[PDB]
From Swiss-Prot:
Name recorded for this polypeptide: Dihydrofolate reductase
Record keywords, A-Z: NADP, One-carbon metabolism, Oxidoreductase
Disulfide-linked positions: none
Keyword NADP: yes
Organism listed in the record: Staphylococcus aureus
Gene Ontology molecular-function annotations: dihydrofolate reductase activity; NADP binding
Amino acid sequence: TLSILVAHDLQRVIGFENQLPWHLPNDLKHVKKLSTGHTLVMGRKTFESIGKPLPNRRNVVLTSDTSFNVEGVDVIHSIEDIYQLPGHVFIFGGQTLFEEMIDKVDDMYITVIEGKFRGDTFFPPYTFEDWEVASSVEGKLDEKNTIPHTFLHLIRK
Ligand SMILES: NC(=O)C1=CN2[C@@H]3O[C@H](COP(=O)(O)OP(=O)(O)OC[C@H]4O[C@@H](n5cnc6c(N)ncnc65)[C@H](OP(=O)(O)O)[C@@H]4O)[C@@H](O)[C@H]3O[C@@H]2CC1
Ligand SMILES: CCc1nc(N)nc(N)c1C#C[C@H](C)c1cc(OC)cc(-c2ccncc2)c1
């Protein structure tokens, strides 16, 4: 199973100056439940922006740097190596790798942030004519989650 896993705002912003533009604890928990025990694949810049591999799952970084090495991180140098990864594989970021993978994945787990943030990194355009809405769940607002958001699982028609 090959999935995209992304949070993006109303204009598909996913990042600003190496940071997430929003603070949404419920989405981090969403990320944890989906991807714990499985595989996250990310381009080099997305990994560096995070700074450490995420615990309790395989962390795979795509880069052309043959000296890249980080404890707890498996390195690949080719898009085609993604297809040899066993198990459930989530494409995690960033804009470049999403552009390379959006036409290849089976499904996408999107968190739509119902806001307009300043961004410099974007998720590719996509149309619902190509994706069936398997589920759409509104996140709950509270104390620490103050931006409306929606969990979409989209599956390729
Ligand atoms: N929500 C997010 O996912 C976020 C993502 N991060 C932002 O991405 C911003 C723009 O960089 P972008 O190119 O989109 O990031 P990638 O993660 O896609 O990193 C791209 C890198 O992956 C590598 N890469 C991509 N495609 C390939 C490929 N086909 N073969 C080999 N390496 C590849 C290659 O690394 P390298 O220069 O070390 O070789 C390439 O430059 C960059 O500013 C990162 O900060 C944000 C934080 C929020
Ligand atoms: C969660 C946000 C998020 N949600 C969803 N549904 N999919 C995603 N792909 C990401 C994401 C992301 C990027 C890689 C990112 C950037 C970052 O820049 C600091 C910190 C984190 C991060 C810090 C702590 N724990 C998990 C992830 C993630």
